[PDB]
Design an enzyme around this catalytic site. Structure first.
Site, PDB file in Angstrom:
ATOM      1  N   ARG A 109      67.040 -89.518  74.940  1.00  0.00           N
ATOM      2  CA  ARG A 109      67.511 -88.217  75.505  1.00  0.00           C
ATOM      3  C   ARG A 109      68.791 -88.337  75.980  1.00  0.00           C
ATOM      4  O   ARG A 109      69.376 -88.051  77.105  1.00  0.00           O
ATOM      5  CB  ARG A 109      66.616 -87.473  76.431  1.00  0.00           C
ATOM      6  CG  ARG A 109      65.286 -86.874  75.781  1.00  0.00           C
ATOM      7  CD  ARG A 109      64.847 -85.361  76.394  1.00  0.00           C
ATOM      8  NE  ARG A 109      65.879 -84.550  76.476  1.00  0.00           N
ATOM      9  CZ  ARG A 109      66.006 -83.871  77.537  1.00  0.00           C
ATOM     10  NH1 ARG A 109      65.450 -83.798  78.655  1.00  0.00           N
ATOM     11  NH2 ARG A 109      67.117 -82.815  77.482  1.00  0.00           N
ATOM     12  N   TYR A 111      73.091 -90.009  74.237  1.00  0.00           N
ATOM     13  CA  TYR A 111      73.883 -90.522  73.243  1.00  0.00           C
ATOM     14  C   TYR A 111      74.458 -91.608  73.524  1.00  0.00           C
ATOM     15  O   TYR A 111      74.434 -92.134  74.809  1.00  0.00           O
ATOM     16  CB  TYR A 111      74.886 -89.466  73.314  1.00  0.00           C
ATOM     17  CG  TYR A 111      74.779 -88.007  73.265  1.00  0.00           C
ATOM     18  CD1 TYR A 111      74.202 -87.216  71.984  1.00  0.00           C
ATOM     19  CD2 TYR A 111      74.912 -87.068  74.245  1.00  0.00           C
ATOM     20  CE1 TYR A 111      73.787 -85.924  71.865  1.00  0.00           C
ATOM     21  CE2 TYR A 111      74.799 -85.716  74.053  1.00  0.00           C
ATOM     22  CZ  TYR A 111      74.190 -85.254  73.034  1.00  0.00           C
ATOM     23  OH  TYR A 111      73.798 -83.719  73.091  1.00  0.00           O
ATOM     24  N   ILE A 116      74.139 -87.874  78.861  1.00  0.00           N
ATOM     25  CA  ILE A 116      72.808 -87.369  78.924  1.00  0.00           C
ATOM     26  C   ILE A 116      72.843 -86.256  77.733  1.00  0.00           C
ATOM     27  O   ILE A 116      73.847 -85.646  77.649  1.00  0.00           O
ATOM     28  CB  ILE A 116      72.461 -86.901  80.190  1.00  0.00           C
ATOM     29  CG1 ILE A 116      73.257 -85.528  80.772  1.00  0.00           C
ATOM     30  CG2 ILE A 116      72.568 -87.880  81.237  1.00  0.00           C
ATOM     31  CD1 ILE A 116      72.837 -84.864  82.197  1.00  0.00           C
ATOM     32  N   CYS A 117      71.589 -86.106  77.130  1.00  0.00           N
ATOM     33  CA  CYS A 117      71.316 -85.101  76.120  1.00  0.00           C
ATOM     34  C   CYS A 117      70.499 -84.097  76.597  1.00  0.00           C
ATOM     35  O   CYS A 117      69.327 -84.340  76.815  1.00  0.00           O
ATOM     36  CB  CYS A 117      70.598 -85.731  74.811  1.00  0.00           C
ATOM     37  SG  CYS A 117      70.426 -84.460  73.557  1.00  0.00           S
ATOM     38  N   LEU A 118      71.028 -82.834  77.039  1.00  0.00           N
ATOM     39  CA  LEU A 118      70.441 -81.654  77.740  1.00  0.00           C
ATOM     40  C   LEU A 118      69.575 -80.934  76.568  1.00  0.00           C
ATOM     41  O   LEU A 118      70.250 -81.022  75.474  1.00  0.00           O
ATOM     42  CB  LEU A 118      71.449 -81.155  78.367  1.00  0.00           C
ATOM     43  CG  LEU A 118      72.330 -81.439  79.327  1.00  0.00           C
ATOM     44  CD1 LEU A 118      73.479 -80.659  79.960  1.00  0.00           C
ATOM     45  CD2 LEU A 118      71.438 -82.074  80.643  1.00  0.00           C
TER      46      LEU A 118
END
Length: 165
Positions: A109, A111, A116-118
């Protein structure tokens, strides 16, 4: 309706922002930064009164590079992570990308590079509210929910350890 009430429950006591300015917009950017600072400090004050003082942030002089720390409590142990982000040129219509660099390569979760990948709901929620949401809203609606899923998962998978200190 459920989304609208959920958003309002989280952010209703955060001062709303007004100015459509990003980093290059001179006196209107200085104005947007006043709105961003007043909104952030109220969020921190509300967090302290709710026993949830969970981050510190500072910026460079121009307010284009932000950095500090967040704290996440699991089973009463407090976990600290360094955080940082650039303000996009197209801010505040475009949302900043929060990076938690120590967690680079440790969760799917996230990159390559520590951004952070929401989930897909944050971005249209930000877009719906332009230019009313700012960095306080980014923390409350973006990084906050990310930590509440990922830190528990990573502690359980034994990828994050608490340093005895």
């Amino acid at each position: 309706s459920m989304a609208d009430e959920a958003t309002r429950r989280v952010v209703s006591e955060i001062p709303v922002l007004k100015t459509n300015a990003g980093p290059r917009d001179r006196e209107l950017w200085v104005q947007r930064l006043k709105e961003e600072y007043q909104s952030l400090i109220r969020y921190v004050e509300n967090n302290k009164n709710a026993d949830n003082d969970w981050f510190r942030l500072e910026s460079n002089k121009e307010g284009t590079r932000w950095f500090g720390k967040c704290w996440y409590i699991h089973d009463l142990l407090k976990y600290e992570f360094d955080i940082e982000f650039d303000i996009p040129i197209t801010y505040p219509t475009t949302a900043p990308e929060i990076a938690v660099p120590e967690l680079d390569g440790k969760t799917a979760r996230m990159y390559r590079g520590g951004k952070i990948c929401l989930t897909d709901h944050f971005k249209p929620l930000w877009a719906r509210n332009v230019p009313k949401f700012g960095l306080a809203h980014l923390m409350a609606l973006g990084l906050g929910p990310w930590l509440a899923v990922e830190i528990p998962d990573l502690i359980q998978k034994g990828v994050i350890h608490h340093k005895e200190k």
